[PDB]
Structure 1
Amino acid sequence: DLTVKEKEELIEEWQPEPLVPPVPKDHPALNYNIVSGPPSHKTVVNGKECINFASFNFLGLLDNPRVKAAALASLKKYGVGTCGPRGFYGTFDVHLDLEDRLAKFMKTEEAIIYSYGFATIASAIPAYSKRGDIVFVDRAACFAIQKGLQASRSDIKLFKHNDMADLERLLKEQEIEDQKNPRKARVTRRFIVVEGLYMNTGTICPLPELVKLKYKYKARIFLEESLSFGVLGEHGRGVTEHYGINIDDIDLISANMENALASIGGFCCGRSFVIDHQRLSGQGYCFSASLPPLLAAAAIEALNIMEENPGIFAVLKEKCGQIHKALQGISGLKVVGESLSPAFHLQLEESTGSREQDVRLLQEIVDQCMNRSIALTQARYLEKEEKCLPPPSIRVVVTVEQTEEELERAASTIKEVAQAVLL
């Protein structure tokens, strides 16, 4: 084979590529916004006072005195750290109380609490779906769902965004492939992974036809309600209440407590038959510390406040209606979103050849708006990693706290700035 001498001199030649490629200095993501003080309404960004149009705080529960008082009481009781997984002396009583409160609020049997919003749906999917199964995931699915699907080794089939003709086409092709080989088709499970209200688009999924397709073609729906959990429906139970669909048809509803509840974490709710598997095969649950008690008590108090007065959902709905109606008329931009969606997008009508020019035009608009005391933000994606990479877009986020006058002024400011910059 090979003599020793050429082996050492081969080992000597080999020079590895550098660990990190040299990033360009003119990277907009490299410069971060330094938000002094709390990121509340009327914040201070980069030294300039700005009304907050960029933070996913739909109900305005981050700065509520009751939430802060409850978190302070729990902090005085238990402290800041849990110091262990949920299996090894890391399960406090507040964790169990919060799980029970979530299960009662969503009218289901069981709920499970994860310490990080990404990990809940990056770890729910790999637990149930294994190698050999089939997943019909929507095209415009957030990065967490994509990494969850990649972690498992199942066969991923991406259908067009909110297009049931494409889903039925894929399902029928799978029926044919099943009839080709029945013995394998007896041990293959079919999942439909959809999101209740997509972050990449701002549009809502049609559950009345997804339920019928699931019942006809022997599939199982995994729903991600992250953005629709606390905003949609009369009582804010998500998209299932908005459509009136029964809660039992959907198998696993996974959301995160960071957006509406304003406390770090995540949770998956469902029937005990589905949930109890995650307590042992969920990696983000078994192999990591539990949620700190103060955050759990803050989430419990937020759930109480959501249960007391359900009118904040109505006022958020009417503010979304007002801002969406006013934003019609931007010269150089188009609104991508719906009158119900809290957080929607502003994209470029006519895109230049390079994406970077679009990114920098939108950044110019964002900066000019910020100087005028309205703080916007641009949607940030990993260009190399996204399977379906959305167009660049400013992001407009609405909340019950912003007055009507602030909404009208935001609309007028964006109109003038966009007409000037796009000219």
Structure 2
Amino acid sequence: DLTVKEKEELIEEWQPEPLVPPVPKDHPALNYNIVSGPPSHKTVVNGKECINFASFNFLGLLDNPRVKAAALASLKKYGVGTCGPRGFYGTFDVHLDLEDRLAKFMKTEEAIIYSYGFATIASAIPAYSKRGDIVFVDRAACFAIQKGLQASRSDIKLFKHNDMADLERLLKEQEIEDQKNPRKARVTRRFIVVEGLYMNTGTICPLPELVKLKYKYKARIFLEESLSFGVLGEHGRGVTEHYGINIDDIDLISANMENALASIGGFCCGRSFVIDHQRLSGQGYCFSASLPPLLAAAAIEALNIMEENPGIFAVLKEKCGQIHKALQGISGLKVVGESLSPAFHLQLEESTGSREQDVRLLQEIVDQCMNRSIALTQARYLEKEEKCLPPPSIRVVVTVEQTEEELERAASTIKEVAQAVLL
């Protein structure tokens, strides 16, 4: 309908917005932390040597000499790069050996390996769940689960954190809707996506009631254990070994090898029936290069170390209990987590209105502690992208390496700094 001259005038008058908006906020995240040398116990941060209370290295296998020797041997035999996807001449013997080792360690029929920690649980969910299904996810799920759910088009319902009456209420509403429309009902699939040990809050999900609800209301459970894979249970199998729940009941278990095993990549274990689908319908699996053999050999040697010595879980548990009990009593802060949790949070007891001021106070505490030679970090989130934004918090991570004296001194340092600042 438009004349031509009007069309060129419309085209020339248009002015797009800049590709990236200006950032006149002086973000603390803009100023990174420069770590000189490996991020291990007694590291150097910003030119100041400090004890590492921030890195996710629970079992202290990052600097174990055996792991380095095994990785060096694999590097000599194969080289750094794999140069191909898993389908096209990218599968080595080390990959199959690692899959077998994981399957035997978790006492599960099959396991699959993803080359990047985020991608495993970012791609597991869309593979099984399609448009039209209903998925019940916990509120405090990590960002990876949220992106996985968004990638699929399935409807999403968020139930309250560790509240089983809320989940039963949602399931009852779903069943009445099911009775309303049976023809749609026969097709829709129900999933319950839950995290083993929550990163954001540092609590533990009540698995037995989840199993009861699954068997009563016919919903398939997807369990994510990024932290609980290598820290919980007598033999470090996971939360399933901690509670005593039979591993058969859980349909799929996802994890990342970066936290405990100290190697890049993730994995997913389950029955062959559910696992075999991911080898074809997993975007992160089919369309990406395989994991380098060096990292796979490092992970295998870490698995051998974990199998040989099961007392490291006990000492880690006792250190977590010790530090968590010691931290109780700070005047201006509150501990958010459970005793068994390796990594937990410290949050302001009474928060000022502006989030930026609270972040500034926490950053001041962190810097003042770093001057005292205890390295701490702050939980980092995306304010806009996060569906449920947790309050700002200082992350505390416990490691088998840290001695009792270091834990006591860190507790006293944080206590003095908090009383100095929050006053």
Question: Same fold by TM-score, threshold 0.5 exceeded?
Answer: yes
Gaps of 5+ in 1: none
What does the per-residue CA deviation read over 1:365-403, in whole Å, with 9 as the maximum and x for residues that have no partner? 000000000000000000000000000000000010000
TM-score of the superposition, structure 2-length normalised? 1.00
What does the per-residue CA deviation read over 1:242-279, in whole Å, with 9 as the maximum and x for residues that have no partner? 00000010000000000000000000000000000000
Distance (whole Å) between structure 2 residues aligned to residue 42 and residue 366 of structure 1 = 17
1:419 Cα deviation after fit: 0.5
Distance (whole Å) between structure 1 residues aligned to residue 143 and residue 14 of structure 2 = 36
What does the per-residue CA deviation read over 1:50-81, in whole Å, with 9 as the maximum and x for residues that have no partner? 00000000000000000000000000000000
SS of aligned partner of 2:345: strand
Distance (whole Å) between structure 1 residues aligned to residue 99 and residue 276 of structure 2 = 13
1:75 maps to what in 2? 75
Distance (whole Å) between structure 1 residues aligned to residue 177 and residue 410 of structure 2 = 53
Q: Does 1:410 align with 2:410?
A: yes
1:26 Cα deviation after fit: 1.4
SS of aligned partner of 2:30: coil
SS of aligned partner of 1:98: helix
Gaps of 5+ in 2: none
What does the per-residue CA deviation read over 1:133-173, in whole Å, with 9 as the maximum and x for residues that have no partner? 00000000000000000000000000000000000000000
What does the per-residue CA deviation read over 1:108-127, in whole Å, with 9 as the maximum and x for residues that have no partner? 00000000000000000000
SS of aligned partner of 2:347: strand
Distance (whole Å) between structure 2 residues aligned to residue 390 and residue 255 of structure 1 = 22
Distance (whole Å) between structure 1 residues aligned to residue 128 and residue 315 of structure 2 = 38
Distance (whole Å) between structure 2 residues aligned to residue 342 and residue 24 of structure 1 = 37
Distance (whole Å) between structure 2 residues aligned to residue 208 and residue 150 of structure 1 = 28
What does the per-residue CA deviation read over 1:266-321, in whole Å, with 9 as the maximum and x for residues that have no partner? 00000000000000000000000000000000000000000001000000000000
SS of aligned partner of 1:307: helix
Distance (whole Å) between structure 2 residues aligned to residue 101 and residue 252 of structure 1 = 17
What does the per-residue CA deviation read over 1:330-360, in whole Å, with 9 as the maximum and x for residues that have no partner? 1110000110000000000001001111100
1:24 Cα deviation after fit: 2.5
1:135 maps to what in 2? 135
2:174 maps to what in 1? 174
Distance (whole Å) between structure 1 residues aligned to residue 52 and residue 368 of structure 2 = 15
SS of aligned partner of 1:396: strand
SS of aligned partner of 2:223: strand
Distance (whole Å) between structure 2 residues aligned to residue 399 and residue 284 of structure 1 = 31
Identity %: 100
SS of aligned partner of 1:229: coil
Distance (whole Å) between structure 2 residues aligned to residue 45 and residue 377 of structure 1 = 11
1:414 Cα deviation after fit: 0.3
Aligned CA-pair RMSD:
0.4
What does the per-residue CA deviation read over 1:90-133, in whole Å, with 9 as the maximum and x for residues that have no partner? 00000000000000000000000000000000000000000000
Distance (whole Å) between structure 1 residues aligned to residue 176 and residue 19 of structure 2 = 47
Distance (whole Å) between structure 2 residues aligned to residue 338 and residue 377 of structure 1 = 19
Distance (whole Å) between structure 2 residues aligned to residue 2 and residue 303 of structure 1 = 69
Distance (whole Å) between structure 1 residues aligned to residue 381 and residue 248 of structure 2 = 34
Distance (whole Å) between structure 1 residues aligned to residue 272 and residue 4 of structure 2 = 62
1:25 Cα deviation after fit: 5.0
Distance (whole Å) between structure 2 residues aligned to residue 175 and residue 96 of structure 1 = 42
TM-score of the superposition, structure 1-length normalised? 1.00
Range 17-26 or range 75-84, more displaced = 17-26
Runs (4 or more) in structure 1 with deviation over 6 Å come to: none
What does the per-residue CA deviation read over 1:197-248, in whole Å, with 9 as the maximum and x for residues that have no partner? 0000000000010000000000000000110000000000110000000001
Distance (whole Å) between structure 2 residues aligned to residue 20 and residue 391 of structure 1 = 27
1:23 Cα deviation after fit: 1.2
Distance (whole Å) between structure 1 residues aligned to residue 231 and residue 166 of structure 2 = 29
Distance (whole Å) between structure 1 residues aligned to residue 215 and residue 313 of structure 2 = 31
What does the per-residue CA deviation read over 1:1-41, in whole Å, with 9 as the maximum and x for residues that have no partner? 11100000100011001000111351000000000000000
1:48 Cα deviation after fit: 0.3
Distance (whole Å) between structure 1 residues aligned to residue 362 and residue 237 of structure 2 = 34
SS of aligned partner of 1:29: helix
SS of aligned partner of 1:334: strand
Distance (whole Å) between structure 2 residues aligned to residue 330 and residue 286 of structure 1 = 50
Distance (whole Å) between structure 2 residues aligned to residue 115 and residue 258 of structure 1 = 11
Q: How does 1:18-167 map to 2 (within 5 A)?
A: 18-24=18-24, 26-167=26-167
Distance (whole Å) between structure 2 residues aligned to residue 357 and residue 174 of structure 1 = 42
SS of aligned partner of 1:388: coil
Range 17-26 or range 150-159, more displaced = 17-26
SS of aligned partner of 1:340: coil
Range 21-30 or range 54-63, more displaced = 21-30
Distance (whole Å) between structure 2 residues aligned to residue 398 and residue 206 of structure 1 = 23
Q: Does 1:204 align with 2:204?
A: yes
SS of aligned partner of 1:269: strand
Q: How does 1:258-297 map to 2 (within 5 A)?
A: 258-297=258-297
Distance (whole Å) between structure 1 residues aligned to residue 17 and residue 110 of structure 2 = 49
Distance (whole Å) between structure 1 residues aligned to residue 177 and residue 360 of structure 2 = 47
1:354 maps to what in 2? 354
Distance (whole Å) between structure 2 residues aligned to residue 372 and residue 189 of structure 1 = 54
SS of aligned partner of 2:253: strand
